[PDB]
Amino acid sequence: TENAAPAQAPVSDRAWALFALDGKGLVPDGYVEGWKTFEEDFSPRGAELVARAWTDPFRLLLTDGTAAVAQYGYLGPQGEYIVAVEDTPTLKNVIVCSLCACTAWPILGLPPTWYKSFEYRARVVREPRKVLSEMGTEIASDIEIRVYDTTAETRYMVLPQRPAGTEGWSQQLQIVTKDCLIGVAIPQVP
Amino acid sequence: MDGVHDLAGVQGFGKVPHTVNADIGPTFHAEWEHLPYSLMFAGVAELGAFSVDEVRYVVERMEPRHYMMTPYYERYVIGVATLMVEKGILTQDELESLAGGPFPLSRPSESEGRPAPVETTTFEVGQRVRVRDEYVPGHIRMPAYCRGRVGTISHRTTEKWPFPDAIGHGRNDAGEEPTYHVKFAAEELFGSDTDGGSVVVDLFEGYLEPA
Ligand SMILES: [Fe+3]
């Protein structure tokens, strides 16, 4: 039939079939298990960087993000050239990869399904205010929205504004969620 | 490549399937999902069989309907598999034998790619640039929404990388270029039909020209 899906084996079967490579000695012992790094090491670390920036005018992070991140030892795959973008009382930053899913893995963690969605990839570049609003984040009309499309090797993190009511908190500050680092959420005080 | 993957600005999609800070569950929602990335790194770092850019391009080369119906991690299973076949490391026969059924792959490339341009300009922060009004059938890291548009330099990278339009096809002539954070007004990109302020695109030097 017209426009129909190609017949395909279950994806689990196709993925494990590809893992053909192992039987040819092309995959080192413990290799994919080692990478499965993804679950434990790559982690929204980004919160630690934000809390440090908030309490240490380190806030180095905005001029040489790579150097700042390297101080914590958090450079890594898909996170080798880092730029932090600062929210201000007149500016809200948001990150996407419209072309695929590019994300600062080591400090944000692997991207979530929603960030990889065609909905986010298509819409946030053109209607970021509506997208954020739908997601539960109301950006005040007096604030400019700036969308960073991750199209090359720069990997971004948002430095969100520090909310009122957190004065004097300990680096407690690390209310900085994955969504805050991507730029779709604002840090919330309980 | 003006493929269906170039989604920025496409209209008609519904709501993003997420509300802020909602539980997104585990990193991997199935036992195979770590494989595409793991096996990509085997190919890139251990075998030296292809670049990360080739992985992006082979996914772009999925038949368009196939791309549109395939979940993210599955696209990379298909892409990495396709590269292993194209590079002569695996055969489709053995993949389908091991899978116990059909394992359709991405379509062959219709472009040999292009070299890094010899003639480019070193731009400075604050300079106005235009995105070269060029059409590239192979891999390119310029989303169509900025083609021929004018914006201002916010950043020039302090590192340089191979030109994707070359290394994405495994060519020997990708050289190295810095990239530029180019800031466009939302209205430069989408006229009156946007609710945004600005959009910053990270563009290779060879995609740009003085305004
Ligand atoms: Fe991406």
DSSP per residue over B116-170, as a string?
Answer: PPS------TT-EEEE-----SS--S--GGGTT-EEEEEEE-SS-B--HHHHTTT
A128 to chain B, any CB pair closer than 8 A? The answer is yes
Q: Of the candidates B63, B143, B198, which has its C-beta nearest A146's C-beta?
A: B198
Please provide the distance, in angstroms rounded to a whole number, between the alpha carbons at the two ends of chain B: 24
Instruction: State the CATH number of the domain containing residue B193.
Output: 2.30.30.50
Please say whether the beta carbons of A121 and A94 come within 8 A: no
Q: How far apart are CA B179 and CA B145, in angstroms?
A: 18
B31 to chain A, any CB pair closer than 8 A? The answer is yes
Resolution (A): 1.7
Cβ-count burial of B209 within 10 angstroms (0-12 exposed, 13-18 middle, 19+ buried)? middle
Domain count, chain B: 2
Query: Could you tell me the CA-to-CA distances from A144 to A127, A130, A141, B30, B87 in Å, in that order?
Result: 12, 13, 8, 39, 47
Query: Could you tell me the CA-to-CA distances from A40 to A4, A105, A173, B65 in Å, in that order?
Result: 39, 12, 21, 35
Pick the CATH number of A1-190 from 3.90.330.10, 3.40.50.300, 3.40.50.1820, 3.30.1330.10: 3.90.330.10
Q: Residue A150 carries which side chain, given as an amino acid letter?
A: T
B48: left (phi over 0), alpha (psi -120 to 50) or beta: left
| B82 and B126 within one domain | no
DSSP letter at B177 equals B
**Between chains, do B197 and A179 touch, taking CB under 8 Å as contact?**
no
Please say whether the beta carbons of A100 and B120 come within 8 A: no
Q: Which of B9, B104, B96, B107 is nearest to B57 (CA)?
A: B107
Q: Among the three residues B110, B131, B152, which one is the final residue of a domain in this structure?
A: B110
Q: How far apart are CA B91 and CA B159, in angstroms?
A: 38
Method: X-ray
| B63 and B128 within one domain | no
Query: Could you tell me the CA-to-CA distances from B169 to A129, B44, B57, B79, B114 in Å, in that order?
Result: 37, 14, 8, 14, 8
Q: Residues with Cβ < 8 Å from B161, sequence gap 6 or more? A: A152, A153, B176, B177, B178, B179, B204
- 3-state SS assignment for residue B47: helix
Neighbour count for residue B57 (Cβ, 10 Å): 29
Sequence spans of domains, chain A: 1-190
What's the gap in Å between the CA of A56 and the closest CA on chain B?
A: 24
B77 to chain A, any CB pair closer than 8 A? The answer is yes
B191 to chain A, any CB pair closer than 8 A? The answer is no
Neighbour count for residue B180 (Cβ, 10 Å): 29
- 3-state SS assignment for residue B64: helix
**Between chains, do B159 and A81 touch, taking CB under 8 Å as contact?**
yes
Helices (H) and strands (E) in chain A, counts: 9, 4
Q: How far apart are CA A87 and CA A181, in angstroms?
A: 11
Q: Residue B76 carries which side chain, given as an amino acid letter?
A: Y
Q: Which residues pair with A76 in a beta bridge?
A: A79
**Between chains, do B202 and A150 touch, taking CB under 8 Å as contact?**
yes
Looking at chain A, how many residues does it have?
190
Please provide the distance, in angstroms rounded to a whole number, between the alpha carbons at the two ends of chain A: 55
Find, in chain A, the residue whose alpha carbon is nearest to that of B4.
Answer: A99
Domain that holds residue B93: 1-110
Q: Among the three residues B54, B88, B110, which one is the final residue of a domain in this structure?
A: B110
Q: How far apart are CA A50 and CA A63, in angstroms?
A: 14
Q: Among the three residues B51, B78, B110, which one is the final residue of a domain in this structure?
A: B110
Please say whether the beta carbons of B36 and A21 come within 8 A: no
Burial B102-118 (b: 16+ CB within 10 A, else e): ebbbbeebebebbebbe
